[PDB]
Amino acid sequence: QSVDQLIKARGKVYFGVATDQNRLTTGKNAAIIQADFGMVWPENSMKWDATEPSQGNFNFAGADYLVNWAQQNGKLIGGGMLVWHSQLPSWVSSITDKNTLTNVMKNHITTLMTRYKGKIRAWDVVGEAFNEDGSLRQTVFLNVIGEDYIPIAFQTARAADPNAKLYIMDYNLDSASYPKTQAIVNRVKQWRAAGVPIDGIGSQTHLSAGQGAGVLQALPLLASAGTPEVSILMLDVAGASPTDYVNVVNACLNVQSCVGITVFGVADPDSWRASTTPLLFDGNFNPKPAYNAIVQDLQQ
Amino acid sequence: QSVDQLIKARGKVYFGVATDQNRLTTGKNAAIIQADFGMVWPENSMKWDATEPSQGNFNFAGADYLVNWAQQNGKLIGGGMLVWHSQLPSWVSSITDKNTLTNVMKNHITTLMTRYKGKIRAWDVVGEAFNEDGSLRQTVFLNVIGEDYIPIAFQTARAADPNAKLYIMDYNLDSASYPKTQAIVNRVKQWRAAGVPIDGIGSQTHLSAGQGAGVLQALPLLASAGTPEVSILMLDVAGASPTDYVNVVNACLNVQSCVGITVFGVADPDSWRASTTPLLFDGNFNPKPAYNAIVQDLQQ
């Protein structure tokens, strides 16, 4: 039974999953995504070291495959990250000239978004821009361009595909009392009041056992930044307890601006932290109790 | 225990496995490969749709990753397929001029091989070139260029990297009485007598329960073509019976020119036919009975 259908029935946009070409051609991933999920997200195939490994040499084969598969099968598509310090090729982090890096950043955004113009529901334009204390992370982009790199990236992205929702993304936004959570709210409010086109906050939710409950307060706080959308992104939960997963889903239902949830893979052995069996299907592609508890929660 | 260490002790070159970047960053695949396998073969990253999706414009991000991982961890590397009708961009298959397709084919081979010159033990230069009845498969290469496309491919390959072993590969070479088995032997003997540098036949061994016994007669028949090497490539066996797998390993051991065996993935859920559970590790990354039977067989 399909959690995407059930969550749409509750007024949300999607229940989604990260995937890529070799997932869709192995295992039972393609069948499960067709039946049970409404949106796909590139596991790796749109990050910077995958898509522009040297200057101007774009690698689009993998993303092309995912985009075509999604369209053929009637699924929504997300993408990102456009601007991110991890998985950043050395040729970008070596740049010290402000104008050069500004144009490199603008060209990377514009080329990716233009290739799939109109087909991508939402992009994470900037990711992991905050330190844990809430100050801005001192990446090459902050150090060289300055604080306006975030305004410039969103402005550039809006011009490239005016139809896409533009998100800022970060992790460790799972507790309301955490400084990072409050800082991103305060900065996003101030950017949007200055005209920066930030449509969404995406919360990359990687939880330990028992941390689902805290998202019931954190997600409302993120929503108070006033963005039209917020999302739960790349969700997984060590142990995959029903309680944790149901708490996260209910946080999504409780927050009007929360458009949906994306889990970080289908089956446990294909997780980046597989020994914590943190996903909704087991190594035999059977649904786990957490999957069934979500169905039951969404039916009510 | 490492099947690769054990097969090396019986005088063979490797026990290998197919993999790629997102396998190495998820599950337990990297740790099992480090401990137990001696060679890696790209699941997808070196095929034509991934490496030359528009004419003359090459994508190497995924393949570079695999080659660097392998070098860092002391593993042999295989590559392919260079010339293959599947996963073939439509810009190639719509060429109708013989000289243009020949140059396109030569440019694809030379670029890939030159980039990793000296780092790749063996290349599958041509794949799946035969029909089941033993005639040559009518691909764009055969139709536009003619049967000379296979000599041209290998000659070009030998010039691009003289240190690499050059292989032709095909499937359903698993029975000594099947027409396709004798047919590839016939043609390889004739090509080699004409000076075509075919160093190896790679037998893409995808078996159903009970077919391992036939490989004991088929692989020596393949070896009668006189190539320096033969190999078992992309091995998997529906049901993963110890008896089938041991029979395949013993065929390798019995054939002087068989240099090793490559299995088509690490764990069952990541197989292209996962429902047949055809690999040596299960969905929790535990070694299966077939793995332990291979260990015992290699120690006898």
Side-chain angles (χ1 to χ4, degrees):
Chain A
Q1 185 137 40
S2 168
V3 294
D4 182 70
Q5 279 186 24
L6 295 171
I7 206 170
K8 288 177 159 58
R10 303 291 294 255
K12 302 307 195 177
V13 171
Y14 63 82
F15 205 124
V17 72
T19 197
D20 257 330
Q21 177 178 316
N22 73 338
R23 307 304 177 188
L24 292 170
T25 61
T26 60
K28 300 190 189 170
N29 302 295
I32 285 160
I33 294 166
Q34 278 156 355
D36 298 326
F37 294 95
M39 173 170 222
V40 296
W41 178 271
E43 180 181 343
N44 283 290
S45 69
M46 289 183 201
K47 302 166 183 178
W48 199 311
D49 61 3
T51 50
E52 207 184 351
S54 57
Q55 193 169 355
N57 188 2
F58 292 96
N59 280 218
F60 289 124
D64 286 354
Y65 188 101
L66 177 58
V67 165
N68 181 63
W69 190 93
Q71 280 191 139
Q72 287 176 189
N73 288 275
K75 310 300 180 173
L76 295 168
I77 311 168
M81 263 152 286
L82 297 176
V83 179
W84 188 23
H85 68 291
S86 314
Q87 288 185 250
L88 193 59
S90 181
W91 71 266
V92 185
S93 50
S94 308
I95 295 167
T96 66
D97 179 69
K98 182 175 175 183
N99 300 141
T100 293
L101 190 60
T102 298
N103 285 328
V104 163
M105 186 190 67
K106 280 169 140 177
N107 192 231
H108 184 87
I109 292 166
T110 295
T111 300
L112 266 62
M113 290 184 72
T114 289
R115 182 172 186 86
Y116 308 111
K117 187 180 183 185
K119 297 175 179 170
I120 304 295
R121 180 179 194 284
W123 285 95
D124 293 323
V125 181
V126 173
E128 305 187 355
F130 287 84
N131 288 321
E132 301 308 304
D133 63 13
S135 63
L136 289 182
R137 184 189 296 278
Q138 292 136 61
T139 67
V140 64
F141 301 103
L142 185 70
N143 289 330
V144 168
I145 297 174
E147 279 200 349
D148 287 340
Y149 92 88
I150 286 173
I152 293 170
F154 280 92
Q155 293 284 358
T156 298
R158 180 69 97 220
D161 187 353
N163 174 77
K165 299 292 157 82
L166 310 186
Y167 278 58
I168 193 171
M169 172 278 243
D170 223 317
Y171 65 95
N172 279 346
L173 312 175
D174 308 306
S175 175
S177 62
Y178 199 64
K180 200 181 190 182
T181 313
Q182 180 66 76
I184 192 176
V185 164
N186 297 341
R187 301 306 294 261
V188 166
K189 268 171 183 175
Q190 294 185 51
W191 281 322
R192 280 182 52 87
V196 185
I198 302 172
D199 298 320
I201 299 178
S203 189
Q204 181 191 148
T205 305
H206 296 311
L207 300 178
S208 303
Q211 292 178 341
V215 179
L216 285 158
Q217 279 75 46
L219 196 56
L221 176 62
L222 286 180
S224 81
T227 62
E229 309 196 344
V230 295
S231 73
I232 290 300
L233 180 67
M234 290 182 288
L235 166 69
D236 49 41
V237 185
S241 164
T243 302
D244 284 312
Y245 261 109
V246 165
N247 281 340
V248 174
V249 166
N250 282 345
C252 168
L253 303 182
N254 290 346
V255 176
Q256 189 75 55
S257 66
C258 187
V259 297
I261 300 167
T262 288
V263 286
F264 198 24
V266 170
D268 279 335
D270 299 328
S271 163
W272 71 283
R273 53 167 172 175
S275 73
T276 72
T277 61
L279 289 177
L280 293 174
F281 297 74
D282 68 19
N284 295 321
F285 291 100
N286 290 321
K288 293 161 64 182
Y291 189 91
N292 299 324
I294 288 175
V295 167
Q296 183 68 232
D297 182 63
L298 291 179
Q299 275 168 353
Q300 293 290 338
Chain B
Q1 229 153 6
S2 163
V3 288
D4 177 77
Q5 268 169 48
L6 293 174
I7 208 177
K8 280 171 160 70
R10 300 302 292 273
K12 302 305 193 170
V13 183
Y14 62 85
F15 207 120
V17 68
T19 193
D20 256 330
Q21 174 171 359
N22 75 343
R23 310 289 183 197
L24 298 164
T25 59
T26 63
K28 291 172 170 238
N29 301 288
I32 290 168
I33 295 179
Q34 287 171 328
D36 300 317
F37 293 101
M39 183 168 195
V40 300
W41 187 92
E43 191 178 355
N44 279 296
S45 54
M46 287 186 202
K47 298 171 180 183
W48 199 317
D49 62 338
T51 49
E52 203 193 353
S54 75
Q55 192 179 334
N57 205 333
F58 291 84
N59 295 2
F60 293 113
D64 282 352
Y65 191 95
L66 181 67
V67 171
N68 292 329
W69 191 88
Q71 290 197 306
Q72 283 182 7
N73 284 284
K75 308 299 192 185
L76 296 170
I77 312 153
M81 268 60 61
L82 294 171
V83 182
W84 190 30
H85 65 293
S86 285
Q87 293 192 247
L88 188 66
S90 79
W91 69 261
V92 184
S93 64
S94 64
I95 293 162
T96 56
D97 175 66
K98 169 171 191 176
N99 172 278
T100 301
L101 190 59
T102 297
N103 288 329
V104 158
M105 187 187 68
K106 292 170 68 168
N107 184 236
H108 187 88
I109 292 166
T110 296
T111 304
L112 266 66
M113 292 187 65
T114 313
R115 187 179 183 81
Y116 309 111
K117 188 170 175 187
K119 304 185 173 91
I120 307 288
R121 185 181 188 284
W123 279 99
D124 291 309
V125 179
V126 170
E128 298 182 6
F130 290 81
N131 294 318
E132 299 308 307
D133 69 0
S135 66
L136 290 168
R137 186 192 295 269
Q138 300 199 345
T139 63
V140 61
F141 302 109
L142 187 69
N143 297 337
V144 169
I145 302 177
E147 60 172 314
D148 272 305
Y149 86 87
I150 292 177
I152 292 171
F154 279 93
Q155 295 283 8
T156 298
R158 176 69 94 233
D161 186 353
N163 171 83
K165 306 292 178 186
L166 306 186
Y167 276 64
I168 186 171
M169 72 84 83
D170 220 321
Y171 63 93
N172 285 352
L173 314 177
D174 310 306
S175 167
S177 55
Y178 195 65
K180 193 181 196 185
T181 313
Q182 185 65 56
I184 196 168
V185 171
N186 290 345
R187 292 283 202 153
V188 171
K189 280 189 71 173
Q190 175 177 319
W191 284 321
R192 281 184 58 72
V196 184
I198 309 188
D199 305 312
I201 303 170
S203 187
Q204 182 189 350
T205 306
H206 296 306
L207 304 182
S208 300
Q211 286 178 345
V215 181
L216 289 165
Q217 287 80 43
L219 191 62
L221 181 55
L222 287 180
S224 77
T227 56
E229 312 188 342
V230 306
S231 76
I232 304 284
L233 183 73
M234 291 181 275
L235 172 57
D236 53 29
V237 183
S241 177
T243 299
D244 282 320
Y245 262 105
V246 171
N247 278 334
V248 171
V249 172
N250 285 340
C252 166
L253 295 184
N254 290 347
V255 172
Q256 195 65 18
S257 57
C258 187
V259 295
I261 301 162
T262 294
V263 67
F264 197 21
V266 172
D268 279 338
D270 295 323
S271 168
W272 67 285
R273 50 170 179 168
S275 66
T276 70
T277 56
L279 292 173
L280 300 174
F281 294 81
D282 68 22
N284 291 342
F285 293 100
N286 293 312
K288 296 170 60 184
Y291 190 94
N292 295 320
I294 289 166
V295 168
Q296 284 309 320
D297 185 67
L298 291 182
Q299 299 193 114
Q300 297 297 357

